[PDB]
Amino acid sequence: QPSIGRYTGKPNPSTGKYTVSFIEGDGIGPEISKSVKKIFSAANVPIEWESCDVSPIFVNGLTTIPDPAVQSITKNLVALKGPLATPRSLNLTLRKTFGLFANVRPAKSIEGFKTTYENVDLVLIRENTEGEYSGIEHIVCPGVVQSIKLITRDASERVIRYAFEYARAIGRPRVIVVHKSTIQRLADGLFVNVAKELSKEYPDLTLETELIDNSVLKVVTNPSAYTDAVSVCPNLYGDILSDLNSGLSAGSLGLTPSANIGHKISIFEAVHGSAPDIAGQDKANPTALLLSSVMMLNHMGLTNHADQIQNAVLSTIASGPENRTGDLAGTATTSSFTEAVIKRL
Amino acid sequence: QPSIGRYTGKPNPSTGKYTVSFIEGDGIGPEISKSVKKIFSAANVPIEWESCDVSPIFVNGLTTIPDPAVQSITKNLVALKGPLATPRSLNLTLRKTFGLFANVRPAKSIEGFKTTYENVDLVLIRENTEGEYSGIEHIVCPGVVQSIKLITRDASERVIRYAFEYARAIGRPRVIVVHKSTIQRLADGLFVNVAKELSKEYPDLTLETELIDNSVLKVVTNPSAYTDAVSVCPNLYGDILSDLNSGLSAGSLGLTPSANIGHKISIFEAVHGSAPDIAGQDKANPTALLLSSVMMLNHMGLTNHADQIQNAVLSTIASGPENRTGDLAGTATTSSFTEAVIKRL
Amino acid sequence: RTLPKKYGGRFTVTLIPGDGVGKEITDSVRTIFEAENIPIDWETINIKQDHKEGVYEAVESLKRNKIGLKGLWHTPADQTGHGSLNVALRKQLDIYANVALFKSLKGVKTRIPDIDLIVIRENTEGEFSGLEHESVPGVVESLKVMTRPKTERIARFAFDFAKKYNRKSVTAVHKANIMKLGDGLFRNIITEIGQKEYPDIDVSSIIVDNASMQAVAKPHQFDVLVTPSMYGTILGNIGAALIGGPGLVAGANFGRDYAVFEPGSRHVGLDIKGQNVANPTAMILSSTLMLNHLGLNEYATRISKAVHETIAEGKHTTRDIGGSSSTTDFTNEIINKLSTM
Amino acid sequence: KYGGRFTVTLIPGDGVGKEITDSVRTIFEAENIPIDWETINIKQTDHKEGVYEAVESLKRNKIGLKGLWHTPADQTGHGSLNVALRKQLDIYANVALFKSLKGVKTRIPDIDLIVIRENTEGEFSGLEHESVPGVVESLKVMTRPKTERIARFAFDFAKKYNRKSVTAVHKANIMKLGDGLFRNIITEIGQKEYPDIDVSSIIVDNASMQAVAKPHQFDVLVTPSMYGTILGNIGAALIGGPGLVAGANFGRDYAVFEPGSRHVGKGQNVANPTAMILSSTLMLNHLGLNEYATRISKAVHETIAEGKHTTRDIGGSSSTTDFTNEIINKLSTM
Incomplete structure (x- = not known):
């Protein structure tokens, strides 16, 4: 496990159980959180929850995060949040308060589930x-918007460090830095240079650089060619590339886990929406939030429980159409799914 | 003597004479430098010259300073340049290479010489x-020029330190930070905040802040009101203010010394031009360069020679119209002036 | 109607007095104006403690009247050209x-x-x-x-x-x-x-x-x-x-459709803090620039001669130009040369 | 028709650009199309005298056919030629x-x-x-x-x-x-x-x-x-892949045709000329020819449809020359 955003352990002195903030969120949030607890209890994992509320408080018009949740999460060092609907930016203040600097986005095919692309195992x-995210827009002359965007060596030498330590920590040879024409934008020149500087502190790892143009051409014609690599990129193309990857693996954000790593705190979440018009009806799909659990476990050190709840479980239960859910042309319900998983748990 | 840009002493091991780079420059440069040497020899000061050439070499189209002069000045730690004509900017590269971050511009009335303002003794x-100086201009839309200008805490906490240590070093109670409306430009808010932070490390000094508007109103109606104070300002208003101060003291840049202080090196110069159309004709006025010499001396520790060559000398010789020079409605020549100074030297 | 508001020979002009000193010098003008019986009705705007409802009311008044007379706030904002009022005049009225x-x-x-x-x-x-x-x-x-x-x-x-x-x-x-x-x-x-x-x-x-x-x-x-x-x-x-000093400097601000008259230095170094001591000259002279603009200006020549004459004879002059009289004394002396004028 | 002959600017590019460009030149002379190339020698996508000559040729002729440089600059839209076409010709x-x-x-x-x-x-x-x-x-x-x-x-x-x-x-x-x-x-x-x-x-x-x-x-x-x-x-x-993507660039007064992917993804005589040829037919349409465009288009579609003579990037094993000659062959029998 990466030295960069290392988990400061310490189970509960009394219970022998690790404390983990929750934030069940809303919409299909509740019922998906419920399924995670029933699979975390049923597999007997060293974790006691602590549901937080992060409803956006306003202080000086600047959106601030409630102190109840701040203290909870600063103490536990880990959180596992579900979806939440849309009112500054909820997700943006979340990352600013807890010093989250890296977003980890896996995209893997599900074995036994026929999707249009095959054998994809991507990490970005x-x-x-x-x-x-820290950009500024303004009107210069009457019909003219100017954008101002910033990139720094410090912030770059940090995702890039993490990218290296993460590739090592999951056993991958190459880290690929994706960027746009290096000579016509010295902003990508700075990112690439920083990556070359760190290249030497990680001799077990091969550093490749690739034009974002070529990356998308390659990955889409043949996703497997990147399952031995970890890609990093600057904030600019991150949104686009990660969503393209999930389109290769699943055809939607439905089955996609994500990790937000900070120097001490780390938040784990699915990236799909609240989907309110399917709330209560028990049709939700907890797979996404489940797999973020796995990433969370692995970040805490509970590797045995991680593989237990991932290896067999939902991965293998997503085989056989009477399971799945409405989204994956299945028939199961969020309840019938949870225990169908506890079955092969 | 200020700890900020402290002079690393060391006379010549053999001669017992300090080494000092020159750069006589051009136009009336030669004849004004000649006068400085004749007065430094005649007052027997511990200094051997080393005339440098700084003619702008071009390296990658970026104007660079010749290596002969670089090594000379980096070694000597002090230089004393006269005027030089105009071919990115000669003076601008000079300050970049040697790490010169502060410009000290005194403006004092000459005792016995009738100018339109009286009793002015200003330090900026x-x-x-x-x-x-590190500014960028570009065309945004077709008739629209945008300017980009930068100010940093680091560079500010440094002229401001120096201003304090220089006020202590010349026995003045107040340092006045000059700025523009603090609440409608958070650039001046940063400069003022930095000054208040350093205020506490210098208890013997009184920190006042003033709107540049009010400063120019006060200083022009009554210059004397500031002869107990040292003013610092951000780079923006520096040009304008220092030239206004010299308009008060003399009505031109003709009698004005300046110092360019860096972390180790320090260059001293007059701020008037080359004035080529009066070169050779022996009509030049060395007072400006002479007074920079005094500042140089005082920066080196030769206080006794400083006051000698300033106290009596040219200050007192500028009394009596058969001295002076053509510029000060006088009759003397640059030669007759030099020894008229050596007289009371 | 691109024109200054005018009914039956009388102009309606916006009056924005400002702070305490602004009100003193503004009242000097009001006083001289009634004394000379000038066809001007003030639509006075009270901007109570870069307060947002007052700025809106002043802008709205200027949109109607087109002409304004403005005093001072001796906050650093008003003196530099920032602060809600000045930006409103510049962004909304395009006074350039x-x-x-x-x-x-x-x-x-x-x-x-x-x-x-x-x-x-x-x-x-x-x-x-x-x-x-x-x-x-x-x-x-x-x-x-x-x-x-x-x-x-x-x-x-x-x-x-x-x-x-x-x-x-x-x-x-x-x-x-x-x-x-x-x-x-x-x-x-x-x-x-x-x-x-x-x-x-x-x-x-x-x-x-x-x-x-x-x-x-x-x-x-x-x-x-x-x-x-x-x-x-x-x-x-x-x-x-x-x-x-600032107390002697007339000023005007123009846009295509609007004009606002006000002391040209914003009384920068016009400290002299006390009651009834401030020099009203800048406000009065700005007042006459306004008269010229409105097409009056017979009135403007008279008022201008009165104040130049009053300050020329060192008597009744205010404290900042070497006299010792109050702003009221100075005003009354001017009005006095006006009746005999 | 009966007209006269169009002069169109031809900017072949680097080595591969010249291969695929020559494929078009060859098909065009075979079909006897009323087009005269005013071919511009631009050393690099940077060569200042070459970029000036290409811009000047486009100002005269208004229409252009342009190959590739496989430098990173040409593929992204930067480099001297592309900025000239955009700043001076306002091709937007x-x-x-x-x-x-x-x-x-x-x-x-x-x-x-x-x-x-x-x-x-x-x-x-x-x-x-x-x-x-x-x-x-x-x-x-x-x-x-x-x-x-x-x-x-x-x-x-x-x-x-x-x-x-x-x-x-x-x-x-x-x-x-x-x-x-x-x-x-x-x-x-x-x-x-x-x-x-x-x-x-x-x-x-x-x-x-x-x-x-x-x-x-x-x-x-x-x-x-x-x-x-x-x-x-x-x-x-x-x-x-990029070898199959037609492209065009338009301003008010000018048009420049060129492969639409800048050929992101060598050896001698192996490159797919399809993108260049198809762009070539977009140009024909624009010039008002396009009877010729329909024929050339049918020829290449037919040639790639039958897996014979196809170039190596779409699973064939033929050279660009073989592919060109097959197309020209279906043309004469049309």
Whole structure:
């Protein structure tokens, strides 16, 4: 496990159980969180929850995160949030308060589930601090919008460090830095240079650089060619590339886990929406939130429980059409799914 | 003596004479440098010259300073340049290469010489690194030029330190930070905040802040009101203010010394032009360069020679119209002036 | 109706008195005006403790009346041209030309005598339309614009003004030596509009640092100065010092459809804090610029002669020009020369 | 007809560019088309005297056929020639056509999208500076007149080629002002000026996902400079690679035809000339020929449909010359 955003262990002195903030969110949030707890109890894992509320409080018009949740999460060092609907930016303040600088986005095919692309196993780490997130827009002359975007060596030498340590930590040879024409944008020149500087501190790893143009041409014609690699990119192309990857693996954000790594805190979440018009009806698909659990486990050190709840479980239960869910042309229900998983747990 | 840009002493091991780079420059440069040497020899000061050439070499189209002069000045730690004509910017590269971050511009009335303002004794320190010097211009839409200007805490906490240590070093109670409306430009808010932070490390000094508007109103109606104070400002207003101060003291740049202080090196110069159309004719006025010499001496520790060559000398010789020079409605020549100074030297 | 509000011979003009001192000098004008029985009705706007409902009410009043008389706030914002009112006047009413008149007065002891310069500064761009940001900690970045249409307006304004008041010199003040593009544009546009459209007027250029030096040492060489936002405050304050202080400086602000009259220095160094001690001259003289503009100005010549005469005889003069009388005493002396006028 | 002869600018490019260019020159002389090449020798996509000669030739002839440089500059839209065409000629609209071909093994069949990208602003007109060490700042503009042009261009193009959907691709969720402007202008110009055409919007990240998973939902995509390259490369992958993608670049007065993917993905005589030839037929259409365009188009479609003589990138083993000669062969018997 990566030295960069290392988990400071310490189970509960009394219970022998690790404390983990929740944030069940809304829409299909509740019923998906319920399924995670029933599979975490049923597999007997060293974890006691602590549901937080992150409803956007306003302080000086600047969106701030409630102190109840801040204290909870700063203490536990880990959180596992579900979806939440849309009112600054909820997700943007979340990353700013907890110092989350890296976003980890896996995209893997499900064995035994026929999707249009096959044998995809992609990992993409994107920067979260700067770029278009800390961007400024203004009107210069009457019909003219100017954008101002920032990139720094510090923030870059950090996702890139993490990318290296993460490739090592999952046993992958190459880290690929994706960028746009290096000579016509010295912003990508800075990102690439930083990556070459760190190349030497990681001799077990091969550093490749690729034009984002070529990357998308290759990955789409043959996704497997990147299952031995970990890609990093600047904040700019991160949104686009990660969503393209999930389109290769599944055809939607439905089955996609994500990790937001900070220097000490780390939040794990599915990236699909609240989907309110399917709430209560027990049709939700907890696979996404489940797989973020796995990533969370693995970040805590509970490797045995991680593989247990991932290896068999939902991965293998997503085989056989009477399971699945409405989204994956299945017939099962969020309840029937949870225990169908506890079956081969 | 200021700890900020402290002079690393060391006379010549053999001669017992300090080494000092020159750069006589051009136009009336030669004849004005000649006068400085005749007065430095005649007052027996521990200094051997080393005339440098700084003619702008071009390296990658980026104007660079000749290596002969670089090594000379990096070694000597002090230089004393006269005027030089105009071919990116000669003076601008000079300050970049030697790390000169502060410009010290005194403006004092001459005792016994009738000028339109009286009893002015002003000291202005301005930042030299950033501002409009490291500025960028470009065309955004077809009739629209946008300017980009930068100010940093680091460069500010440095002219401001120096301003404090220089006020202590010349026995003045107040340092006045000059700025523009603090609440409608958070650039001046940063400069003022930095000054208040350093205020506490210098308890013997009184920090006042003033709107540049009010400063120019006060200083022009009554110059004397500031002869107990040292003013610092950001690079932006530095040009304008220092030239207004010299308009008060003399009505031109003719009698004005300046110092360019860096972390180790320090260059001293007059701020008037080459004035080629009066070269050779022996009509030049060395007072400006002479007074830079005094500042140089005082920066080196030769206080006794400083006051000698300033206290009596040219200050007192500028009394009596058969001295002076053509510029000060006088009759003397640059030769007759030099020894008229050596007289009371 | 692009015209100043007027019913039956009477103009309605917006009056924005300002703070306490602003109200004192504003009342001086109100008093002289009733005494001279001028056909002006004040629509007075109370901007109570860069308060948002008052700024809205002043803008709305100016939209209706087109002409305004404005006092001071002696907060740092009002004196520099920022603060809610000034930005509203500049963004909503497009008032783009600030004019300050620096004429020496007959009975005021000044180190340099007989000064007569006019400073015209651009009021919608540069300093007044930037963007500033701190994107990495400890680093502040400014992004300011200079555009040709805005600089063409200010050029034509300056030249049209020189024409109207028989001035013979217009000098553009700029920093084109360093800002070769932006301030180059400024110097060029002014000098071109000079040669092609106003040949009877001498155009010239001066770098701003040199102009500062030249202004304190030999002010007589200048006539009309035109400058960007950023240098006009500095030149104006040299101007104010040259003639005996902010209390003597008339001012006006123009847009295409609107005009607002107000002391040209914002009473910068007009401290003299106390009750009834402030010099009302700048407000009164600005008042007469307004009269001229409204087409009155028989009234303006009289009021102007009265105050020049009153300050010429050292009696009843206010404390900042060496007298010892209150603003009220000074006002009453002026009104007194008016009845016998 | 009976006319005279068009002079068109030919800018062959590097070695591969010259191979595929010569494929077109060969097919054209074989079909005896009334076109005279005014061929311009541009050493590099940077060679200052060459770029000046190409611009000057385009000013005279108005129409151009342009090969590739496989430097990273040419493939991204930068480098001296591309900026000259954009700054001096005001060529503002890049069009790429992604049609699936009958005999090419693709994971998703029957694709037919058109990507139209703005070519004078955003990425192509910025300013970048490093003013404090280790900090790079970008200043880009999006303006309403440039986005109105690209809007009308896209809708005018949909109208002319009987396309029924135009989707604006943007990032207005984050860039609420600039990309908001873009989305709004496209949708307004749609409802007021082109009612017979369906307008829609899609955030660019979602469009990426949607393009690799369900390409069929899209028809004509219109995007700013910055997202065009990414969407275009998904497009190229979807139909079997860059060698199959026709392209054109338009200004008001000028048109330059060239492969629409800049051939992102050598050896001697092995490159696929299809993209160049198809772009060549777009040019024929534009010049008003296009009887010739229909024939040449049928020839290459037929040749690639039968797996014989196909070049190595679409599963064949023939050289570019073999492929060209096969096409010319079906032409004479037509």
